[PDB]
Design a protein around this nucleic acid. Structure first.
Lengths: 54, 99, 79, 93, 82
DNA sequence: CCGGTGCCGAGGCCGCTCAATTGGTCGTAGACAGCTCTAGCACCGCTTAAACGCACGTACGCGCTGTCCCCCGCGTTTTAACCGCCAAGGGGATTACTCCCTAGTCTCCAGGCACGTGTCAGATATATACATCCTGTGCATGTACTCGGGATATTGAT
């Protein structure tokens, strides 16, 4: 999954960002790794529906 | 005369810009000085590894980001978009820290 | 006095990663409290681990062990 | 009105008994456990511990739900509060 | 009648639990939702309690099994063994 | 014409009169104290044997310590969408009543599986000689960060 994410990012080297994306996007891996934080991995992009403009 | 942006669009611009990158926000030197002074307040004449302080920084940033995400949920629950401290207190209490 | 080293734009940036549009002006002074308290626990452990090994330098593994005892696990620092 | 409810509120916060009838809880537990494996037998203390833990969980959940409802300048609790409490505590999303 | 036993958790029981929690008013949509929540909890304990019964090659679920199952979920229970 | 004055209407005081609340007494019954072995059994006393824990030097890097430069923070301005307050319509959760019904008690019955012991055998600790897989070191090069300039959006004001 990390390699798939890195390919989607159009780069051939896996960095912590790809691992973070792979963990968070997959439900089971996120459930397993719920209480762990990936160093310099950030957070998924998310905007609440009510916060969008008109 | 100069082109002015609406109040709120720059907010989402900054949201999108920061939610993609993964750099450290807090300036390194103030954080190091803060942790050094706290440590001396506990135990004087201490030495810190740079990796240790950067790991403290990353843990603190992750904690703050999660706290602010919960605060955002609390604020939206109250039919609002501005975050006030009562939202933070509610989140902190339900998580089970403060109370 | 160094808690003021956590400037206001830094708090704004941290909030912006979380996904919030508007920030009250009195949030910072309370938020600096949370940073003040959450950081006062890991160090409690971090120095204490250091004080068990007869050594007086806080290595990068003591903070990992503290955060593990508290329930927040981090990767990439020899965990 | 609005004071007979507070009578209950004060009464139940002192007494310490099981607020769910035992037989329906036993039937529920047996039916839930049927899927994992057929033809099981249950220790009575196991059922009692299950019911005690579930009641404690529900009481804590409703405490947090009431805090959520008070936050939004209301007195009535709605599922919009339970979902928020579960989300921010960490059992969902 | 062929009725699911989740509805055996009667509405007055849920009201009693809520009143023990300290709530004045109860909307009408809580009653179906809470049962669902009560399902999920029992889906995360009995599942564990059966597994221990598997590992001991036993056929009767004991109180120690459920106490250990609750212990690993950060919900330790006192006074029922262990 | 206006004004004194009686009659009536309303506001203020005080007090029971009565209906709902809560600590005190009676009483009986299953369950906390408390021997009684027992029982065998962990705990203690009394020995040695081996090793890990501890301290002394001593080599050797990784934290503190001093100097230039801009990038981010500070501070100001205006203004506008949001917060907070107020008010009214109405739905629905509340409260109370009668009626139904399955929880709760306990009694009786009985066969399934917890639970312990006894037997024995093969899976696993352990020691020694063999050897090769992983690890520190060294080094070529290329994927990726950075700078610069031209596409395509992407918002705001007429």
């Amino acid at each position: 999954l990390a390699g798939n994410a890195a390919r989607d990012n159009k780069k051939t080297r896996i960095i912590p960002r790809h691992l973070q994306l792979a963990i968070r996007n997959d439900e089971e891996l996120n459930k397993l790794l719920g209480r762990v934080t990936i160093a310099q991995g950030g957070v998924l992009p998310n905007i609440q529906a009510v916060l969008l403009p008109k | 005369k100069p082109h002015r942006y609406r109040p709120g669009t720059v907010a989402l611009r900054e949201i999108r810009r920061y939610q993609k990158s993964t750099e450290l926000l807090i300036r390194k030197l103030p954080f190091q000085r803060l942790v050094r002074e706290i440590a001396q307040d506990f135990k004087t004449d201490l030495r810190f590894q740079s990796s240790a302080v950067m790991a403290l920084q990353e843990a603190c940033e992750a904690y703050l980001v999660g706290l602010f995400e919960d605060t955002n949920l609390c604020a939206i629950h109250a039919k609002r978009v501005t975050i006030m401290p009562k939202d933070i207190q509610l989140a902190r209490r339900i998580r089970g820290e403060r109370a | 006095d160094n808690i003021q080293g956590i400037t206001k734009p830094a708090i704004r940036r941290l909030a912006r990663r979380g996904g919030v549009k508007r920030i009250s002006g009195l949030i910072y002074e309370e938020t600096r409290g949370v940073l003040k308290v959450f950081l006062e626990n890991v160090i409690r452990d971090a120095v204490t681990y250091t004080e068990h090994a007869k050594r007086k330098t806080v290595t990068a593994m003591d903070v990992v062990y503290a955060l593990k005892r508290q329930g927040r696990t981090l990767y990439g620092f020899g965990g």
